Structures are given as structure tokens and as C-alpha cells.
Design a protein around this nucleic acid. Structure first.
Lengths: 108, 185, 137, 204
RNA sequence: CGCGGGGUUAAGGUGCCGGAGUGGACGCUCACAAAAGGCGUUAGUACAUCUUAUGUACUAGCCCUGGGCGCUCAAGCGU
RNA sequence: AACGCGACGAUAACCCGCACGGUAGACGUAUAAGAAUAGGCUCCGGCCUCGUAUCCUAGCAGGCGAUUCCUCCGCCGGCCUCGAAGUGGCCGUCGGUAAUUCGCGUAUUGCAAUUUAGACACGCGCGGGAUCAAAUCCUUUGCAGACGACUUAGAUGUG
């Protein structure tokens, strides 16, 4: 037995959309990557693939898992938060939900 | 009327909760805190007054007293109270063998329709050696509780009343460490 | 007439006290400017431990136990270098436990993924002699 | 350094009130579960009597309070004094706001689930890191006790019991520290010293 | 001031509600009204003693008297 | 608190049919002193800016057989422990078990398109035949009664 994990993604949290005081634009989302805290670390994760995985309580391909895919476009703020653009905007109730940041495409 | 008693409302319980007990200190001897009686009646008393400063010294005050009958109190149960940030609470209660007839009819409401099996598998637990649980239960009282009240009833079968249903209250044991007041209980 | 006082014995700031900046470089105080700023200089031969002569804010700094004994006040870079080599500040700093933690940290960070696979394998071998020793006692 | 935990337990001793509340409310909205213990050991800056006017001022500007939910109810325990602070920092009239408070869970003292678990601290809200040495401070326990909290001697005696259990925990951890350090020294003689230098050259 | 994508800003902001700093440097403060009361603190000026450190009065800060949550080596004020 | 809570007593089953396998968000979801911050810890040698740490971490999403190890993990019983809103330790049975060294198979899933893997609540939930235990109703009673409302006592008995 291995008794080891299989994770190949960095963990993230969907914080909010791009917004002012009161004008929120759903077409861009804000992600807090675990471990990143400056703009310098966010520069590594730019243009990496980002998946949002959830459950839907109906099987369509033998699975109740659905994924929404996206990418990290630019850093946000000074604290390592990044801006993400997906094929469709993330729901709203996923504010504070898990996000898998992949390591591809890679330039290492 | 006094504001401390209005608005007027009927007592929801016939016996009436005690609502307050004297404060406990270990240094006193073990003793109980209350008892139930039955209001039998009231009479007249003459008395040799010996109260200093009273002009009725060594003389005959005439006073009226009440006669409260008190049947011997059969002890059936014990309870222990543990202290919590949300106030006092029941941790456990424990009973005994051979629970008498009138205490079950308080536990019941329709004696005559129902059949007599209250405390049956509890008494079966006492007889068929789950004594480790009573060893667990009595020691659990010792270790954790800080207030212990005894559970006892009065008996109609001794007093001249036409009822048959008993009356239960909880009576504290104060005056000692937590270890001493349970072995007495 | 017995006095037993258990207080905190801090490190002085003075001429000759060497201090640690955040980049890992050392500097010897030669004149104190204010309660918050001193002017210091590190004439170390090591490129990693050298520091230009200039003002060091004490908030950015950390006081080290090493102190140059009789460093003259306001000594120019040559005079601090003379006391640096005579007292051997670099040798005493390497013995200091603060540098071993730094050297452990830098060597840990330079571990590649394949040398990370050694350590996973290698600590496992060391751990096995630890457990029969632990089971023995 | 921005790590995601399952639930993080915050010890409340020596922590300032609103700075702990601001940090907690941001993590709840980000998706972090928060458990706060020792709410009676939290600190509010300034003297005790300054805390007394703002208690009297909050009851001033509210005519006909609900006795059960609000008014002086919020000050009658230390756990819900903190809950009042976090609630004003969270959009409680939204369903995202209600969800953030269900991640929060505050207590007075250390309940039995959380005395066997690890209690972290928040450096940005610690009293001894943020307050000047001469400045005077009050404890929220003595604020709620002078308002009407009834179980100050209760939570004290359960805490002095918990220290006594914790004293036995160290004495077991002392013996493990002896045996672990002894076993490290004992097995180092037969540790195959081609490999001991390999670990030292890698940092371990 | 047409309908969209991207980039940069203004006025305002960057403790939480709220996107953005519990960011950096140096000080001060603990909460109507007048040459006003301060044995609270700090900053500056003018006079007097001294091997024959002071003590008197002013000037300037700013305070005591005259959005919510919450904040006090600020989440206040000035640069 | 009838829309807060705790302890305890007594407590609903077989047959036939037929419909489906949530959660504001698991992916190693590992880590218990206390106390102070003009100090503190300890193995009594020494040690504390730094949790930038410690444990765990290899194999078909992890096989088979060995060489080889008595290390680690899990289930049931016993002995003890845990009650502020209950749990862990020790011993024993059994099963697995790269610390070391190998031989077997993985492919053509064709260069990515979901890594369909945890926890908890009950398997979700329904319609007809099938059984205890209580209560409501009934009679009666008076410590109670404007009417409601409340309280006795009715099945073998100090009825």
C-alpha cells in the first residue's frame, strides 16, 4: 500500500468578483491561492489553468461532478490575490469555495 | 395588591416547587434540607413566655398553631447535579430496588387501564448483574457532581386521606464533602 | 544581606556591538545617532556578510551577542576592519546558533525534487533504528 | 503564511476585541471555520470605566428593546459580546452573511472538544504586541460580570480543573521528550554513518 | 452618455461590512470662547543663581471644563 | 421561552408491491501544557527573532510471488479511563505491513478535456394486509371550580 496522496493542484478560494463599492462585474473573479502572499508569488501562477469542481445531484455521464475551467490572468492587489477568467462566470454562492489551480501550462 | 405577586396566575403544579435551598458548606454535618407534610388542622396553645424585654414574662401567652401530619418518608431515589457554564444540570439520577406501589401511580396517569411494569427492566438491570453500571453510576455521582438531592415521597397509605397517589420532591444533602453525602444517600 | 533578583539582562547598544540586518549581513555600530537610528559598518571579507557604511535603523536590525571589545567611536572603515580581523567576528558568527539556523534554512531551500526523494527515503532508514531503540526503552 | 486549515481554534487570552473580530470576519467570508475559546479573557483597550459608558450608551439609543434577543442581553456573556462584534462586521442581512456566522463558533472557557486540540494565536490582535506598555486595558469578563454575567466563578473553577489535567499532560510529554532524545542518541552509533552525513548535507 | 472586450486613471479610498496597505518615516493626544481656568504632557522664546543644574513669565500644539462594527506604539491629527 | 434546555421511566412488528442511492464546499482536510512579554524553558549539558518547525509521505487510485523485517496500521474482547456539549490508554486474537533486495504484468485510454475515491443524517423516501404501550374520550371525585379549566379513583384491592 502507498498511503500517500494524489494532489497535483494548489488549493484556492473564490473570494469575490471584480467590484467597486457597489458595482460588481461577474465576468472576472478573485482567487486566494494558498501560500501566495505578495505580487511576486502571483506572477508564477499567471496563465495557469483553474478548475471549479462541484456536485449537481444528477448523473449525466455516470458522474455528478461538473467542472468549470478558467485561467489566472493578472495579479490583484499587493497580497497575492489573482484575477481569474472562466468560460462562464462562477455562480455567486461559490464565494468562499474551493478552487483547484493546476500546474499547467508550465515553464519550469 | 403588591406588584411582586401580580399578575395573578394559578399554580401550574399542585405541590409547588421549593425554588431555593440553603447554601452548602462541607464543614457542617450531613443532614437533609426539606420534607413534605399534610395539613391536618390547627388548635390553640397556651405558653409560658420567657422572652426578655417582654412584658408577658413568666406568664400565659395564648397562641394558635397548626398541626401538620408527617408520614414516614420512603426514600426511593438520588440525583446529582453538575455545574456548567449554562447553569446547573442533571448529570444522572439513580433509584433502588422494590419501588413501592404509590410512587408508580404518580409516574402513571391511568393506573387502572394500564398494567404494572414501571421500573421493570430497570429493576431487571439491578438483579441481572449490571452492577458495574451501578458501580459506574454511583461513582459518577462521587467524582463529578457538586449538588446531590435525594428523591423521596410521602405515603397516603399511612395518612387518613382518600387519595392513593404519592408526592415526590428532591431534598438536598448538605454538610460534607461530595463523597460523604452520597454514601449516606 | 543576600539579594536575589531575577530580571531580564538585555543586550546593550554601544560602540562595538555587531548587529544582524534582514539580508543576513552584519554591521558594527560606531556612533549612535538617536534612540532609533545608529550608524554602523561591516567590513567583512565575505560578500554575503558585508555591509556598506551607513545608517542602520534599529527597527530593521537584530542585536547579536558578539561585541568588539575596544572599538573606537566613529572609527572609519579601515579601523573597523582592523578590529574585525583581530577579534574574528566572522568565525564567532559561524559558531553562533543564529547562523546555523540560517545555513540549515538555505541548504533546505536548495533541495531539488530528486534530492527531496533521497530525504524521504533517507529519513525512513534513520527512523527505523529510532524505533527499535524507542521500543527498547 | 496563508495556509488553509479545517477548523482553526483561536485562544482568546491577551487578544484585543475589534482587531480579533476584524480578522475573524474576513476569514469567515473567505471560507475559514473559526472557533474562539476563552472569550472571558479577551481584552478591550482603555480603562474599565470607558467600557462602562459605551455599554450605557448602547442601551440609551434604543427604545423598547427585546429582552431575550438584544438590549442588555448582548452584554450578559463574554461569548456573545464577541459575537456582537463579528456580526457588525459581516453582511448579516444577506445569505452569505448568515453562512459566515455559521462558520463561527464562540465559547467561554475551553469545552472538552477543544482542550485536546491546538489553539493558535493572532499576532495582529495581541494586546502585548499592539498596545503601548503604559496604556491601561480592561478584560471583557469583568465587563460582562458588572453587567450581569452569572457564571464567572463557574468558568473559573472549570478552568483551574483544566490546568490540573494539563499539568498531567506535560508530565507525560516530559517523559516522551526524554525517551525520544535518548533514542536519538542511542541509535546514532548504528545509524550507518554514510547516511548521517547525507542528511546533514541536506538539512535534516 | 451608441453596444461590447482589454488596459490606465480621476474625485475618493486601501481594519471589517467593501475591491484595495492592520504599508514605511517622525512627532502629539487617552476624550459657545475670554490677555479663561490645568500641581496633565510635549515643543520654543525672554530674564536671574552657580565650587565665590536650576526658577519665573510667556508662545505654539492639543486635550479636561468652557454610518455601523469598532479603534488608542490608531483604524485619531500634521507632514 | 407553550416556537430554550438536562436527567429518568415506559415505549411499533412480519408480509406484499415499487422509487432512488444531501451538506456555504474533503483531497495528509495530521499537531492539547500553562504563564509572562522589564522575561522564560530544560534532559541541568544548555537553550528562545524564525511553526521557514514536528509527524506522516515510494508500490495497478498502489497488484502477485519472494528475499527479508518483527516496525507500523486496523477490527473485535478484557482491564482501566474520560461528564463543561464524554473518550483515550494498556494487554490479547486476527488481518495487512519496501527498514533492505528483486522477478513478474500496466501500453492502442493513441499529446489535456471529471483525479467519478472522505465525513456525517438516516440507506432516500411511499402505498395496502400487522402489534405493543400510553394518552384523549367515559364514569366518578373535590383540596378546584362564572362557564370552560384543574384534581382524585375505577382492571382483585388497606378496592
Amino acid at each position: 500500500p502507498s498511503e500517500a496522496g494524489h494532489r497535483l493542484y494548489v488549493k484556492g478560494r473564490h473570494l469575490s468578483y471584480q467590484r467597486g463599492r457597489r458595482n460588481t462585474h461577474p465576468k472576472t473573479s478573485l482567487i486566494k491561492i494558498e501560500g501566495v502572499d505578495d505580487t511576486a508569488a502571483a506572477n508564477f501562477y499567471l496563465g495557469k489553468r483553474v478548475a471549479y469542481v462541484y456536485r449537481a445531484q444528477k448523473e449525466v455521464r455516470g458522474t455528478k461532478i461538473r467542472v468549470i475551467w478558467g485561467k489566472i490572468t493578472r495579479p490583484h492587489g499587493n497580497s497575492g490575490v489573482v484575477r481569474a477568467k472562466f468560460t462562464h462566470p462562477l455562480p455567486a454562492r461559490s464565494f468562499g469555495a474551493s478552487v483547484r489551480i493546476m500546474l499547467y501550462p508550465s515553464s519550469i | 395588591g403588591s406588584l411582586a405577586f401580580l399578575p395573578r396566575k394559578r399554580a401550574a403544579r399542585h405541590r409547588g416547587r421549593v425554588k431555593s435551598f440553603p447554601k452548602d458548606d462541607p464543614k457542617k454535618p450531613v443532614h437533609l434540607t426539606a420534607a413534605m407534610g399534610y395539613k391536618a388542622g390547627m388548635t390553640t396553645i397556651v405558653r409560658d413566655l420567657d422572652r426578655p424585654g417582654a412584658k408577658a414574662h413568666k406568664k400565659e401567652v395564648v397562641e394558635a398553631v397548626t398541626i401538620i401530619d408527617c408520614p414516614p418518608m420512603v426514600v426511593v431515589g438520588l440525583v446529582g447535579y453538575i455545574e456548567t457554564p449554562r447553569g446547573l444540570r442533571s448529570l444522572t439520577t439513580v433509584w433502588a430496588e422494590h419501588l413501592s406501589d404509590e410512587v408508580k401511580r404518580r409516574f402513571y396517569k391511568n393506573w387502572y387501564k394500564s398494567k404494572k411494569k414501571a421500573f421493570t427492566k430497570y429493576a431487571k438491570k439491578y438483579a441481572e448483574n449490571n452492577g458495574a453500571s451501578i458501580t459506574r453510576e454511583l461513582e459518577r455521582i462521587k467524582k463529578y457532581c457538586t449538588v446531590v438531592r435525594v428523591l423521596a415521597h410521602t405515603q397516603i397509605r399511612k395518612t387518613p386521606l382518600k387519595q392513593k397517589k404519592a408526592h415526590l420532591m428532591e431534598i438536598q444533602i448538605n454538610g460534607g464533602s461530595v463523597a460523604d453525602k452520597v454514601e449516606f444517600g | 544581606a543576600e539579594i536575589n533578583v531575577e530580571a531580564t539582562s538585555w543586550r546593550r547598544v554601544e560602540v562595538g556591538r555587531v548587529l544582524k540586518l534582514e539580508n543576513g549581513s552584519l554591521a558594527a555600530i560606531v556612533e549612535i545617532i538617536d534612540h532609533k537610528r545608529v550608524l554602523a559598518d561591516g567590513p567583512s571579507s565575505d560578500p554575503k556578510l558585508a555591509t556598506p557604511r551607513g545608517i542602520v535603523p534599529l527597527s530593521r536590525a537584530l542585536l547579536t551577542p558578539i561585541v568588539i571589545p575596544k572599538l573606537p567611536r566613529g572609527a572609519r572603515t579601515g579601523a573597523v576592519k582592523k578590529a574585525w580581523e583581530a577579534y574574528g567576528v566572522d568565525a564567532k558568527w559561524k559558531e553562533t546558533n543564529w547562523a546555523k539556523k540560517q545555513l540549515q534554512q538555505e541548504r533546505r531551500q536548495s533541495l531539488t525534487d530528486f534530492d527531496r526523494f533521497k530525504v524521504m527515503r533517507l529519513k525512513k532508514q534513520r527512523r527505523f533504528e529510532e524505533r527499535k531503540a524507542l521500543a527498547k526503552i | 503564511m496563508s495556509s488553509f486549515e479545517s477548523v482553526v481554534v483561536i485562544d482568546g487570552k491577551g487578544h484585543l476585541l475589534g482587531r480579533l473580530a476584524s480578522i475573524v470576519a474576513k476569514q469567515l467570508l473567505s471560507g475559514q471555520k473559526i472557533v474562539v475559546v476563552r472569550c472571558e479573557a479577551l481584552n478591550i483597550s482603555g480603562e474599565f470605566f470607558r467600557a462602562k459608558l459605551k455599554y450605557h450608551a448602547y442601551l440609551r439609543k434604543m427604545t423598547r428593546y427585546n429582552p431575550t434577543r438584544g438590549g442588555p442581553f448582548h452584554f450578559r456573556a463574554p461569548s456573545r459580546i464577541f459575537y456582537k462584534a463579528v456580526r457588525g462586521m459581516i453582511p448579516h442581512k444577506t445569505a452569505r452573511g448568515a453562512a459566515a456566522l455559521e462558520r463561527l463558533k464562540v465559547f467561554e472557557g475551553v469545552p472538552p472538544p477543544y482542550d485536546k486540540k491546538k489553539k493558535m494565536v493572532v499576532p495582529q490582535a495581541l494586546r502585548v504586541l499592539r498596545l503601548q506598555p503604559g496604556r491601561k486595558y480592561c478584560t471583557v469578563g469583568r465587563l460582562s460580570h458588572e453587567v450581569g454575567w452569572k457564571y464567572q466563578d463557574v468558568v473559573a473553577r472549570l478552568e483551574e480543573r483544566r490546568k490540573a489535567k494539563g499539568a498531567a499532560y506535560y508530565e507525560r510529554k516530559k517523559l516522551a521528550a526524554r525517551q525520544l532524545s535518548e533514542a536519538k542518541k542511542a541509535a546514532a552509533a548504528k545509524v550507518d554513518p554514510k547516511v548521517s552525513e547525507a542528511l546533514a548535507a541536506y538539512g535534516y
